[PDB]
Design an enzyme around this catalytic site. Structure first.
Site, short mmCIF file in Angstrom:
data_model
loop_
_atom_site.label_atom_id
_atom_site.label_comp_id
_atom_site.label_asym_id
_atom_site.label_seq_id
_atom_site.Cartn_x
_atom_site.Cartn_y
_atom_site.Cartn_z
N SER B 203 40.78 6.72 39.63
CA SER B 203 41.94 7.51 39.29
C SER B 203 42.89 7.56 40.50
CB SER B 203 41.42 8.86 38.82
OG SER B 203 42.44 9.47 38.00
N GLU B 327 40.37 6.45 28.14
CA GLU B 327 41.15 6.95 29.28
C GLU B 327 42.01 8.20 28.96
OE1 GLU B 327 41.04 6.20 32.32
OE2 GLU B 327 39.94 4.28 32.41
N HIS B 440 37.69 9.40 31.39
CA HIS B 440 37.67 8.80 32.72
C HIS B 440 36.98 9.71 33.71
CE1 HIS B 440 42.12 10.12 32.49
NE2 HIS B 440 41.40 11.13 32.94
O1 LIG Z 1 48.01 21.98 41.01
N1 LIG Z 1 48.25 22.65 39.82
C1 LIG Z 1 47.27 22.83 39.06
C2 LIG Z 1 47.40 23.53 37.78
C3 LIG Z 1 47.55 24.91 37.82
C4 LIG Z 1 47.67 25.60 36.63
C5 LIG Z 1 47.64 24.88 35.44
C6 LIG Z 1 47.49 23.50 35.45
N2 LIG Z 1 47.37 22.85 36.62
C7 LIG Z 1 47.22 21.40 36.64
C8 LIG Z 1 45.77 20.91 36.45
C9 LIG Z 1 44.77 21.91 35.91
C10 LIG Z 1 43.37 21.32 36.01
C11 LIG Z 1 43.34 19.92 35.41
C12 LIG Z 1 42.15 19.10 35.92
C13 LIG Z 1 41.67 18.13 34.84
N3 LIG Z 1 40.55 17.25 35.26
C14 LIG Z 1 39.56 17.76 36.01
C15 LIG Z 1 38.49 16.97 36.42
C16 LIG Z 1 38.46 15.63 36.06
C17 LIG Z 1 39.50 15.13 35.28
C18 LIG Z 1 40.55 15.95 34.90
C19 LIG Z 1 41.65 15.39 34.08
N4 LIG Z 1 41.69 14.16 33.80
O2 LIG Z 1 42.73 13.61 33.04
#
Ligand SMILES: O/N=C/c1cccc[n+]1CCCCCCC[n+]1ccccc1/C=N/O
Ligand SMILES: O/N=C/c1cccc[n+]1CCCCCCC[n+]1ccccc1/C=N/O
Ligand SMILES: *[C@@H]1O[C@H](CO)[C@@H](O)[C@H](O)[C@H]1NC(C)=O
EC number: 3.1.1.7
Lengths: 524, 530
Positions: B203, B327, B440
């Site tokens: 990634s 993905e 992924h």
């Molecule tokens: O930095 N800002 C972060 C934030 C804050 C408030 C709401 C949303 N966000 C974005 C991301 C949330 C967490 C997303 C993580 C997703 N994820 C985690 C582990 C492995 C893969 C993935 C996503 N893959 O597409």
């Protein structure tokens, strides 16, 4: 004096000729006049009904073919010659033909009316492939075919003018239908059961009769083979027709009334001489004089009319052949000829697309290219050649047909759909062309029942099946003999493959690709 | 020393280290955890390039993971393994520039090929100390020297006022490069061969690896590269200098802040304050973009990655690239309406249209239409299962699969030896729902060999599978060829061959989503222009 060959119609007496079919005799009435000859001051004008005649009119032979350009591409080649006029050319050409069972039907018999194709610049009801004897003999059908004006004589319009209104070629066909309502009963035919069928431009013509109220009372059912009233080639706007008519007038040395007067003084062969130059083009995708959206015969564009129509009580059979595009290519698409395998380059493919989709912008052209390229074999010449064929066939026939099928079904029609996949063993075009449009016709008309034409015996059984589907459809609105052929619907999208194997039901008529042409390209 | 295990005492350029003897299923390995490679980028050093770590005195204890770089912590499903396993597992701190080394035990006598891991996490998260990045198995089973490093993420790693001296951008990348330099200078102390260094990442980790390929000063620090589900090209991995300026300026305002004064004010903000605002800088329903990523600064990146892979000479390069089967699926549960881990996420056509606007936020109405039409099943345009899966494919293809196909294609055309795979095995232990297939990140635990740990409850076939994969990756690290001397042929532009990775033996396939990637890589761009 065989009484089976004497008939009285409104205009007077007629004498036909007893013809031989493989299974027995048929009565044929050929070259029946249905209109006043459209000559002199009647050129470009709506047809007038034929005046009554004295004595017994000889209807034993085909009449003249309507004045038209004759294809000279491959002199002496069967594949081309079979479509060329087989009687003398003449503006005096408004005659229809009737075939019937001998002896003439006990009770009123369903009538099929054929309307030839030829891009609105050519065609004739007297070609061997339209011979009605087999359908009449084997199925007991009454078969009718008419000549109608093509080229400038049929479709040159100065819209809004009184002396060149446009669509007179379609009015010709309409007058032949009227003639059938008034006279066919005298031949043992049922005016209450009339099925139109046509191919390519004849199919579009059938379409236009569906979309034009005054025609609707003259037939009950319809078959459109490889053609539609919608799509890129079948109609022209009033503005664009005026432009072409004026350009052609200029090209031959000629206020509407004066312009039309001057055209009327021109020898037929002069008009034909300049027909093609009104739309300079490398191939044959568009023709200059086709039906016009006049707000009269066609109250609006076929697109507008099929989207909003009410088709509740209409049954329709429509279909395409396997290789709709191949035919076009040999007519001026560089890289293609009947005499080699036409393996083309990528560059040739791109230029091919500019020709086959003349209306396309650079972006639209690229979308087409990118859609039809096989990205696993981007430069394979065999793929490029087949793709070129597909582009041209999809854009002109297959997707216009899928779209018509869908709209009719959505809006109340009962619809059956097919893809025709058998390549006549006697085809003289090369293999790479597969099954080109027009080569299903001889099977529908039953030519392979004639042993002297040297079709395989399976081809004969195949032709018998088709004559059944078509005539079952004419009888009943349903091609199934009383696996099944299911109605085409927007939900399930079923159609059937017509070939030597038994009916196979398939779903989705080039669905992804036609979404590309019918939904995406427009927006682009 | 005197009484300690002689195999755990090592000297590097900065000083002496005491590592720890760890147990792996087949026997012991040496781990050196938490070795500093930079001055802690704290205080006046925030947003700045990393400075190399100054020598210490005494024996630095290298027996535990060090801090995780300051970052947002995912709280989408509290308690849920599927989210938690990616969450920081050490204290958050700006003082986080440490790396880790695993080596066989006893250390190899002849120089051994080095693998360097660069984690992903969208450039806003990640840590080299997560369980799925455990170097122990690769070291014990394949005799590899494995190295992984923390690098700055979020604003700390990527906030840029392009042109300033105080916040030049790409410092997170500069952290990785510094660790690559530390490996060049020191890895021989561990029996590693600095002349054989394979980078691998997943990634944003992969995009990272791809940027080291594209940036000349990094090219002397490694020899081979693996990019798993990510690329320097594509819609999320970089931003322009102008856009990055705009975002940092906006973030400064969100928290209460001439570039020098602005950055000075940022430097006075508490780390948690920056984290709490970074996501607001770019309003969005779901995680397809992040605000602070590598910037095209004309320095680290002398041009866009797109331009560099088109014009680059990659004759010397051997590269292994690939994607997992699904993905896109992961993305969807993070805020595409209609999607959930807890139901089957059957969606409507309208939800699909809306999902496409969110998943391809850069699309005009026409572009969005093209996408919808391309991915619509016209036989069943309204079927909620096909629509659900098409939403996943749209977002998967646009963000990973097609950028990877384009990458493999450019490299192959321009001299590189490329190998390509699609990974299609779904772990038996996966806690995300079936509809998500193989999301992924879920190939990683197999590449790192976790299933050799019997306490993890993987099946026997998964254990045999993981060995296969470890062999592919380490053969590639050793020789530039994943094959063991059915074959894995190179990927070429003529044949476009790649292999399926799953429980069955290698199967060769042709064309990586070729039709659809022609749509994203050739047509869509032109539709952008109009
Ligand atoms: O930095 N800002 C972060 C934030 C804050 C408030 C709401 C949303 N966000 C974005 C991301 C949330 C967490 C997303 C993580 C997703 N994820 C985690 C582990 C492995 C893969 C993935 C996503 N893959 O597409
Ligand atoms: O009116 N002007 C006609 C003309 C004059 C000089 C050069 C070209 N044209 C166009 C048509 C040529 C003949 C094309 C007919 C092709 N064709 C014949 C029989 C059956 C099918 C077809 C074409 N199918 O696509
Ligand atoms: C599943 O969960 C989400 C989030 O609660 C909800 O919005 C969606 O409507 C649900 N979908 C189905 C198919 O139940």
């Amino acid at each position: 004096e065989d009484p089976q060959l004497l008939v009285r119609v409104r205009g007077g007496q007629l004498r036909g000729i007893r013809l031989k079919a493989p299974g027995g005799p048929v009565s044929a009435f050929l070259g029946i006049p249905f209109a006043e000859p459209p000559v002199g001051s009647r050129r470009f004008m709506p047809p007038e009904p034929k005046r009554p005649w004295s004595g017994v009119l000889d209807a034993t032979t085909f009449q003249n073919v309507c004045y038209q350009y004759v294809d000279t591409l491959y002199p002496g080649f069967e594949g081309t010659e079979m479509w060329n006029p087989n009687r003398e050319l003449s503006e005096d050409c408004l005659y229809l033909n009737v075939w019937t069972p001998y002896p003439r039907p006990a009770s009123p018999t369903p009538v099929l009316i054929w309307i030839y194709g030829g891009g609105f610049y050519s065609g004739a009801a007297s070609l061997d492939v339209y011979d009605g004897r087999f359908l009449a003999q084997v199925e007991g059908a009454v078969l009718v075919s008419m000549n109608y004006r093509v080229g400038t004589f049929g479709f040159l319009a100065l819209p809004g003018s009184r002396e060149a209104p446009g669509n007179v070629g379609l009015l010709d066909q309409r007058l032949a239908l009227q003639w059938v309502q008034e006279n066919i009963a005298a031949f043992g035919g049922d005016p209450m059961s009339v099925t139109l069928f046509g191919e390519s431009a004849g199919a579009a013509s059938v379409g236009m009769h569906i979309l034009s109220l005054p025609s609707r009372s003259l037939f009950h059912r319809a078959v459109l083979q490889s053609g539609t009233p919608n799509g890129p080639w079948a109609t022209v706007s009033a503005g664009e027709a005026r432009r072409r008519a004026t350009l052609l007038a200029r090209l031959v040395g000629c206020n509407d009334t004066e312009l039309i007067a001057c055209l009327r003084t021109r020898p037929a062969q002069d008009l034909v001489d300049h027909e093609w130059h009104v739309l300079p083009q490398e191939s044959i995708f568009r023709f200059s004089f086709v039906p016009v959206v006049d707000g009269d015969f066609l109250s609006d564009t076929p697109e507008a009319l099929i989207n909003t129509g009410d088709f509740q009580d209409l049954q329709v059979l429509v279909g395409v052949v396997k290789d709709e595009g191949s035919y076009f290519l040999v007519y001026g698409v560089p890289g293609f000829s009947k005499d080699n395998e036409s393996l083309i380059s990528r560059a040739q493919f791109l230029a091919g697309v500019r020709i086959g989709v003349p209306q396309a912008s650079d972006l639209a052209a690229e979308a087409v290219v990118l859609h039809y390229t096989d990205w696993l074999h981007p430069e394979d010449p065999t793929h490029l050649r087949d793709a070129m064929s597909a582009v041209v066939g999809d854009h002109n026939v297959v997707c216009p047909v899928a779209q018509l099928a869908g709209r009719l079904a959505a809006q109340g029609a009962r619809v059956y759909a097919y893809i025709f996949e058998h390549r006549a063993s006697t085809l003289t075009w090369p293999l790479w062309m597969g099954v080109p449009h027009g080569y299903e016709i001889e099977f529908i008309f039953g030519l392979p029942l004639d042993p002297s034409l040297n079709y395989t015996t399976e081809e004969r059984i195949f032709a018998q099946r088709l004559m059944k589907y078509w005539t079952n459809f004419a009888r009943t609105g349903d091609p199934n003999d009383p696996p099944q052929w299911p109605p085409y619907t927007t939900a399930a999208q079923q159609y059937v493959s017509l070939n030597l194997k038994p009916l196979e039901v398939r779903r989705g008529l080039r669905a992804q690709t036609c979404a590309f042409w019918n939904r995406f390209l427009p927006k682009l």
